[PDB]
Design a binder for this molecule. Structure first.
Ligand SMILES: Nc1ncnc2c1ncn2[C@@H]1O[C@H](COP(=O)(O)OP(=O)(O)O)[C@@H](O)[C@H]1O
Ligand SMILES: Nc1ncnc2c1ncn2[C@@H]1O[C@H](COP(=O)(O)OP(=O)(O)O)[C@@H](O)[C@H]1O
Lengths: 426, 426
């Protein structure tokens, strides 16, 4: 069937923090935290308050559903599982797999269908470029099981940045995509150029980790130790320099211009003091650069530090650059194609979503800008030739891609373990 | 008709790398690679990107049409096809003929005609001397078919080096003509003296493969593995010695005068180091004389080797000299005739296109010179009496050759099977 294919195509982007899902039909994707809450470490008179089915699996998942069992916990550090801390789930790590399985279930679960025609979903799934083969068969297995519980006609799985490309509708480009734990920057010429893939071991999270170590310095060590806390602080105070060293001065001589405060809870309000307005920039710049003495100051001894990690063959570089990285990405393609591929730089993901506060264009930069700056800094030659833009709706990009890709990808194509594309059926 | 014949005569040189094509009217022929892209192994939302018409044949050709589907598949070995790798298409090799047909169509396709009078092209085709009878019947069959899609009045097929004779307008001469895969050297006295035909089994391609192995030694193994890169390197750094050992010693003792760097893509730039500037000469000299311990060093163990191949009756000699081959050619004609056939040495093909870097005539040599030199080396006798020149525009010679030949070659002359000359009509 076909018209069918415009109602009943189902898209599911994973990655780190949220999991965007929903039918081809939504104007936007629903959005769900990428964590599970485990049920063992818990008082009993609230285990009865829990339906017997949900008690079955040691797992609860949901934006509101986990929201409201958070206060009565024993080990919130042991009982809260984040698989895909790094876009990748540790091969054998069982809880991590289980979370994903319920994450997979929950999402499908939100859209039951009354239509008598419905004869299954067409599920498309977006995983990190970083994602190894075992992880594909894993995700394949999950959806395989879940067709006992729901009508699933077919399932496939393209990479995340590929989806952005399909989503943008740009055949040739380099796609740099930052989410929570890392930025995968990946060149596309109709498919993922897998040797040109660079990953950075730093994402939306160092932006928190700098926020968190700033709040302690202002003197809010209370709020600091709560993640939900630092997120909205950072999301709301965070700034990106045009050049940082120039920005710092501009705010040290005119604090007033840059001071801010934001209400977290009707009771709570965080003000960034005249004393510290200038750290607002370390929040933003650290996605893009981490090479300034001022950012080096909080890695001195302070909390979760900046380093390289290794997943597949691939090494996510702790320090490098978005710039140095997009170049290194380019040097790793066919000499033939570097022209048409450096043509088009597309920024997607949460971690690039920064805005300039009205009246601050002076020295604050949005990410498209911060990046172009970085290129002219590095290669006036390239920069000139390059068109860098950011997607509208950075979170939902990888989604829209997944859904178009799921739409037309004809049903005759079977998944051939090694072609790395095509439908599976159960 | 006649003024007709100056508008609508169509020229088609084949051979190994490029196919020069175009109406008699163009100052230069169009140029198009002698390969095809086979469509089975591909991304499917990117064959939605192809005409279903061109999805018809498993084949695309086009200098740009192939260019932009090249990143869609890594290790292009099997998905890319060069028929006439050696100037001949392997007899039954089905895909090689398949390419040829679409190559044949493509070329014609580029010149649509609006004129009411047009009632057919007058097509002339250049093939290697080397080209067996089946291949003439085959190429004849091709154009026979496409006359259903295009207005084709008549067709005929002359040898490559004979076209150069006609193009040069030299009744009596030896034509040495070199492309990618081989140099054919063939004596002309109104006709091509078929017993005088010698082929060298090496062309502009060894100058690449010396480049390729030179590149690895400098330490650019990445770049070396792409054809498009090596070509551009070769073409840009390659040198022809006056005498090689005299040239090496000249660049070992003064590297600076011989170092060079060259921009491949706005990112990559390949420098030939102070250390190796002398290998630039191995690029040049290899077309002409693969007999030096230095060139023998890379045949030692290294990649695609220098050997004898065997086509029709003819053996393409791996190791021989353009000078020794020129002699041997001569020794196979009428003793009566050797005088004014050796009178005139004509140099054609891209493979001879070498230029000397301003201020290097000192020790570097263009191919006219390098050959002349090789003759006074071998027959001081011969040399003196001989005038050796290079065509201007060596790429496009064979082509003007074919158009003049197709121009005046009376239409009453039918293509007989054994006379090996005349028109077919379809
Ligand atoms: N304005 C903003 N500036 C910087 N980062 C942001 C902003 N808004 C949201 N984020 C980041 O969004 C991230 C989560 O987004 P998401 O697209 O789900 O990435 P992933 O799927 O890799 O977890 C968090 O790192 C948070 O830091
Ligand atoms: N400057 C140059 N020096 C030497 N060879 C060149 C140069 N430019 C192009 N070529 C050569 O042109 C050759 C192809 O010539 P072509 O006339 O198409 O022969 P064929 O048709 O037999 O392939 C390639 O070997 C390439 O090396």
């Amino acid at each position: 069937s076909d018209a069918y294919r415009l109602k009943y195509t189902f898209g599911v982007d994973f990655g780190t923090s949220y999991v965007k899902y929903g039918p081809i039909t939504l104007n936007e994707p629903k959005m769900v935290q990428t964590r599970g809450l485990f049920l063992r470490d818990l008082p009993e008179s609230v285990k009865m308050r829990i339906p017997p089915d949900v008690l079955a699996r040691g797992l609860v998942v949901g934006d509101e559903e986990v929201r409201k069992y958070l206060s009565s916990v024993r080990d919130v550090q042991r009982n809260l599982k984040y698989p895909l801390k790094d876009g990748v789930a540790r091969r054998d790590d069982e809880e991590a797999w289980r979370v994903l399985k319920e994450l997979a279930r929950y999402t499908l679960a939100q859209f039951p269908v009354s239509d008598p025609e419905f004869a299954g979903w067409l599920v498309a799934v977006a995983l990190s470029a970083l994602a190894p083969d075992y992880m594909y068969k894993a995700i394949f297995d999950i959806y395989d099981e879940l067709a006992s519980e729901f009508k699933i006609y077919a399932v496939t799985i393209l990479p995340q940045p590929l989806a952005v490309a399909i989503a943008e509708n740009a055949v040739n480009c380099v796609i740099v995509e930052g989410g929570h734990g890392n930025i995968q920057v990946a060149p596309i010429s109709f498919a993922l150029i897998r040797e040109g893939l660079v990953a950075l071991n730093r994402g939306g999270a160092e932006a928190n980790a700098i926020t968190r170590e700033i709040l302690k310095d202002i003197g809010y060590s209370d709020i600091a130790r709560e993640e939900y806390a630092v997120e909205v602080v950072k999301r709301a105070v965070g700034l990106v320099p045009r050049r940082l060293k120039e920005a710092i001065r501009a705010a040290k001589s005119d604090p007033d211009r840059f001071v801010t405060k934001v209400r977290l809870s009707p009771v709570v309000e965080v003000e960034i003091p005249r004393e510290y307005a200038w750290t607002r920039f370390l929040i933003g710049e650290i996605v893009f650069d981490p090479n300034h003495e001022e950012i080096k100051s909080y890695i001195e001894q302070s909390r979760l530090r900046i380093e390289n990690a290794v997943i597949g063959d691939v090494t996510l570089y702790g320090e490098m650059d978005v710039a140095s990285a997009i170049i290194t990405s380019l040097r790793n393609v066919s000499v033939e194609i570097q022209e048409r591929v450096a043509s088009q730089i597309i920024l997607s993901g949460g971690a690039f979503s920064w805005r300039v506060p009205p009246g601050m264009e002076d020295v604050a930069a949005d990410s498209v800008t911060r990046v172009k700056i970085a290129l002219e800094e590095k290669s006036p030659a390239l920069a000139s030739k390059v068109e860098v833009r950011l997607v509208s709706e950075p979170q939902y990009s990888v989604w829209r891609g997944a859904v178009i890709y799921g739409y037309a990808l004809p049903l005759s194509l079977e998944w051939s373990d090694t072609t790395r594309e095509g439908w599976r059926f159960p």
